[PDB]
Design an enzyme around this catalytic site. Structure first.
Site, PDB file in Angstrom:
ATOM      1  N   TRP A  60       0.880  -1.167   0.000  1.00 42.89           N
ATOM      2  CA  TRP A  60       0.000   0.000   0.000  1.00 42.89           C
ATOM      3  C   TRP A  60       0.923   1.223   0.000  1.00 42.89           C
ATOM      4  O   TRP A  60       1.655   1.450   0.962  1.00 42.89           O
ATOM      5  CB  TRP A  60      -0.883   0.002   1.259  1.00 42.89           C
ATOM      6  CG  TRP A  60      -1.774   1.207   1.374  1.00 42.89           C
ATOM      7  CD1 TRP A  60      -2.479   1.801   0.371  1.00 42.89           C
ATOM      8  CD2 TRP A  60      -2.056   1.963   2.566  1.00 42.89           C
ATOM      9  NE1 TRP A  60      -3.181   2.881   0.859  1.00 42.89           N
ATOM     10  CE2 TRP A  60      -2.945   3.000   2.199  1.00 42.89           C
ATOM     11  CE3 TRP A  60      -1.650   1.862   3.900  1.00 42.89           C
ATOM     12  CZ2 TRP A  60      -3.433   3.929   3.124  1.00 42.89           C
ATOM     13  CZ3 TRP A  60      -2.135   2.786   4.820  1.00 42.89           C
ATOM     14  CH2 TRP A  60      -3.018   3.807   4.425  1.00 42.89           C
ATOM     15  N   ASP A 111      -0.338  -5.160   9.755  1.00 41.09           N
ATOM     16  CA  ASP A 111      -1.350  -4.224   9.286  1.00 41.09           C
ATOM     17  C   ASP A 111      -2.518  -5.147   8.974  1.00 41.09           C
ATOM     18  O   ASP A 111      -2.412  -6.026   8.105  1.00 41.09           O
ATOM     19  CB  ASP A 111      -0.912  -3.494   8.012  1.00 41.09           C
ATOM     20  CG  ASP A 111      -1.875  -2.375   7.616  1.00 41.09           C
ATOM     21  OD1 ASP A 111      -3.014  -2.340   8.117  1.00 41.09           O
ATOM     22  OD2 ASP A 111      -1.500  -1.501   6.816  1.00 41.09           O
ATOM     23  N   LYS A 140     -13.391  -1.455   6.298  1.00 41.16           N
ATOM     24  CA  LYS A 140     -13.938  -2.336   5.292  1.00 41.16           C
ATOM     25  C   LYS A 140     -14.936  -3.354   5.828  1.00 41.16           C
ATOM     26  O   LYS A 140     -16.062  -3.410   5.347  1.00 41.16           O
ATOM     27  CB  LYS A 140     -12.812  -3.011   4.503  1.00 41.16           C
ATOM     28  CG  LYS A 140     -11.940  -2.034   3.704  1.00 41.16           C
ATOM     29  CD  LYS A 140     -10.810  -1.433   4.542  1.00 41.16           C
ATOM     30  CE  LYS A 140     -10.231  -0.163   3.911  1.00 41.16           C
ATOM     31  NZ  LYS A 140      -9.712  -0.365   2.538  1.00 41.16           N
TER      32      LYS A 140
HETATM   33  C1  LIG Z   1      -7.701   5.335   1.338  1.00 38.65           C
HETATM   34  C2  LIG Z   1      -7.198   4.031   0.747  1.00 38.65           C
HETATM   35  C3  LIG Z   1      -8.164   2.876   0.955  1.00 38.65           C
HETATM   36  C4  LIG Z   1      -7.572   1.494   0.710  1.00 38.65           C
HETATM   37  N1  LIG Z   1      -6.401   1.239   1.644  1.00 38.65           N
HETATM   38  C5  LIG Z   1      -6.829   1.372   3.115  1.00 38.65           C
HETATM   39  C6  LIG Z   1      -5.753   0.608   3.908  1.00 38.65           C
HETATM   40  C7  LIG Z   1      -5.337   0.880   5.265  1.00 38.65           C
HETATM   41  C8  LIG Z   1      -5.964   1.985   6.124  1.00 38.65           C
HETATM   42  O1  LIG Z   1      -7.251   2.360   5.837  1.00 38.65           O
HETATM   43  P1  LIG Z   1      -8.218   3.051   6.864  1.00 38.65           P
HETATM   44  O2  LIG Z   1      -7.386   4.131   7.491  1.00 38.65           O
HETATM   45  O3  LIG Z   1      -9.286   3.684   6.010  1.00 38.65           O
HETATM   46  O4  LIG Z   1      -8.529   2.189   7.952  1.00 38.65           O
HETATM   47  C9  LIG Z   1      -4.368   0.188   5.981  1.00 38.65           C
HETATM   48  N2  LIG Z   1      -3.718  -0.831   5.358  1.00 38.65           N
HETATM   49  C10 LIG Z   1      -4.011  -1.197   4.066  1.00 38.65           C
HETATM   50  C11 LIG Z   1      -3.132  -2.362   3.662  1.00 38.65           C
HETATM   51  C12 LIG Z   1      -5.031  -0.457   3.351  1.00 38.65           C
HETATM   52  O5  LIG Z   1      -5.199  -0.946   2.099  1.00 38.65           O
HETATM   53  C13 LIG Z   1      -7.120   1.353  -0.744  1.00 38.65           C
HETATM   54  O6  LIG Z   1      -7.467   2.160  -1.702  1.00 38.65           O
HETATM   55  O7  LIG Z   1      -6.315   0.284  -0.908  1.00 38.65           O
END
Ligand SMILES: CCC[C@H](NCc1c(COP(=O)(O)O)cnc(C)c1O)C(=O)O
Ligand SMILES: CCC[C@H](NCc1c(COP(=O)(O)O)cnc(C)c1O)C(=O)O
Lengths: 396, 396
Positions: free
Chosen positions: B130, B211, B246
């Site tokens: 990510w 994570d 999610k």
């Molecule tokens: C804003 C991005 C959303 C999404 N990734 C969100 C995301 C997060 C943290 O998200 P949140 O703070 O909303 O709990 C942590 N870790 C991963 C591996 C993620 O993919 C994506 O587009 O992969």
């Protein structure tokens, strides 16, 4: 990795809540944290807030992400609250607002922004001030210098010392000002003093940073923004961190804003894009709930009308309480004259009590105040006023 | 101060939402951000969530501050989700949980904690990962090194390369692992591979940082935590940043958690006190709403039952979609074999498309995917599957 981590010292303000709840004793009184209490000693959720929340419950269709800067209507509304509806800052598109997790999150995003995209190295914070100011700035790498403010003897704003202290601030340094309801003194500069500070600030090249967490608690919504507006008329650049925790009773929903002002739209846009970069590396996007409540209330004529009344009710109760406080102090046999309390603004009052007195108040009487002698006047009720004043007098 | 600030480059993931909404054209399809969509192409708020919110509307009495670490029941619930009910980590009081503004805020508070109370200097993040991982860690001062992960040719987990890359990590370094649903590959280690990584990790003295943002989307709540639990059985210390964005569809409410695990309660308490210090210097305390919703749902048998079903429905729809995707690709005349898509877990799939193909997909067909070739399978509906696959085939 953690075997050598030393236990951190407790926050003078927040660590107080811990001790209080852990303390048994029915008559224990809490005059610590700045949270409003009504006649009954409760901190209810505003009616206007309950109504907006119902509106949201039935009308909300998704919880899809909010965008780095948050809800647009929210941003539009705070700029008008801060700058006025007609305002040229709005018309010329010189300001950008990012929704943040409270006034504290606004200060942090501002600090992270300044530290990485600007040449600022030091931030000037008043003496005394909200303890958490230095912690926030220090966390971003900036250094905190202090300027004189309160005249303990007269209980006034020592303007000469303020000026004389700030004369050591260099062009390019940040100077943090409290919009209104100076925490913890309650003493604020007059419009004259605010204009003077504005002039001085423009000549010395300081970057004004206003902390506005109590808009509405001194004189009124518009009145409380007089100083900031005086600065905004003269400055090309300024940052303002505002909070809706107190005036909306939204403490635990974390509703605040970080407004950035630049010489023009083009500039402010480039600067703001970096601010959004700091936010993305912190929490991504802000919590919708509390902010949607603020926007729905501000966008609706009836709801806003009800809110504004609730706010003046809170302000007026606080004012009745500090007046009762002074009288009951004199009536109960206090030797010192505490009339200066009636001259202060906001939820607090600098009692002028010593660290030891505050400690005995707690240990012996279950009365909780901050070590600095700051007491939450908004936490006083006609029912706890008597025992409270007796505890104080037995410690003077 | 701001005249030289350079405009920041847009986030590959979030900057995508901007372009999409700005793009006209009715048939434009959005396979970018990781947000779930149902058969109708909407991202509704869960029913269990609507019910909890009503419960709160009628039962909430105050918005008074929440305390640095947030709601206790919330913390108790995530530890059981992560570690299991019987778990010794819970029984021996080795873990502490702080409620945070999303999984992103959890990573940041963890980074701020590590950077100021620990001797960590570098964090190891997979390649690919990510995008926002490096930005968060870099913001706290840590440096990010990358380890091999995906085998693009076979579309497998290149374990040998993973091991060989990590062999350059020193004792005291942090290694970030994705609990399940590896973003953006979708490939995850088996239980065997997870146990091996656990052993290696203990011998080399690495600090595991998991994570966990997709618990429930691969196989199940309990199954998806198998790897982490394997690590927790062997390690004395670990940090886990989890998200409820999610699996609870609470994206804009910012609900996440930062769980700290130490050799014993006494130690973990001292370490956690510093973590709370990092939080106070950032946002003070967390937003109540989304977290109270999670706790009320998890604390109630009926509500949790409804939630768990909603979650399996989402998981299963995603699984029907990626299967339909592959078939329709072959049916529409795709030359390459995309069967490997069916082997991946979570909301995404690494299409294996080139940067140029992704650009033409958008510019020419209004189809939005991430430059890396990552596409949100959960954004596919039986209705947009045809035009989508035609766009893709006309670009291979
Ligand atoms: C804003 C991005 C959303 C999404 N990734 C969100 C995301 C997060 C943290 O998200 P949140 O703070 O909303 O709990 C942590 N870790 C991963 C591996 C993620 O993919 C994506 O587009 O992969
Ligand atoms: C938690 C402390 C509450 C209160 N000070 C809260 C406070 C804030 C930020 O508060 P929030 O993030 O909740 O918007 C900003 N600025 C001042 C001057 C404050 O007094 C006090 O005890 O003075």
């Amino acid at each position: 990795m953690f075997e050598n981590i030393t236990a951190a010292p407790a926050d003078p303000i927040l660590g107080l809540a811990d001790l209080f709840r852990a303390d048994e004793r029915p008559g224990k009184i809490n005059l610590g944290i700045g949270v409003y209490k009504d006649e009954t000693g409760k901190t209810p959720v505003l009616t206007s807030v309950k109504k907006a929340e119902q509106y949201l419950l039935e009308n909300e269709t998704t919880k899809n992400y909010l965008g780095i800067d948050g809800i647009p209507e929210f941003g539009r509304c705070t700029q008008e609250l801060l700058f006025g509806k007609g305002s040229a800052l709005i018309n010329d598109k010189r300001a950008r607002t990012a929704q943040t997790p409270g006034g504290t999150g606004a200060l942090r995003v501002a600090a992270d922004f300044l530290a990485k995209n600007t040449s600022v190295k030091r931030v000037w914070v008043s003496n005394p001030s909200w303890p958490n100011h230095k912690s926030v700035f220090n966390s971003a790498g900036l250094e905190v210098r202090e300027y004189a403010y309160y005249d303990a003897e007269n209980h006034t704003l020592d303007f000469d010392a303020l000026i004389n202290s700030l004369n050591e601030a260099q062009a390019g340094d940040v100077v943090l000002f409290h919009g209104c309801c100076h925490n913890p003194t309650g003493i604020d500069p007059t419009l004259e003093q605010w204009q003077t500070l504005a002039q001085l600030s423009v000549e010395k090249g300081w970057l004004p940073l206003f902390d506005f967490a109590y808009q509405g608690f001194a004189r009124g919504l518009e009145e409380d923004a007089e100083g900031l507006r005086a600065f905004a008329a003269m400055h090309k650049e300024l940052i303002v961190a505002s909070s809706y925790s107190k005036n909306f009773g939204l403490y635990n929903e974390r509703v605040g804003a970080c407004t950035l002002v630049a010489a023009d739209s083009e500039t402010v846009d480039r600067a703001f894009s970096q601010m959004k970069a700091a936010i993305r590396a912190n929490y991504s996007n802000p919590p919708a709930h509390g902010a949607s409540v603020v926007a729905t209330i501000l966008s609706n004529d009836a709801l806003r009308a009800i809110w504004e009344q609730e706010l003046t009710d809170m302000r007026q109760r606080i004012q009745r309480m500090r007046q009762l406080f002074v009288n009951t102090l004199q009536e109960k046999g206090a030797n010192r004259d505490f009339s200066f309390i009636i001259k202060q603004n906001g939820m607090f009052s600098f009692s002028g009590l010593t660290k030891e007195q505050v400690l005995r108040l707690r240990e012996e009487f279950g009365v909780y105040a901050v070590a600095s002698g700051r007491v939450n006047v908004a936490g006083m009720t006609p029912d706890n006023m008597a025992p409270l004043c007796e505890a104080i007098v037995a410690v003077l």
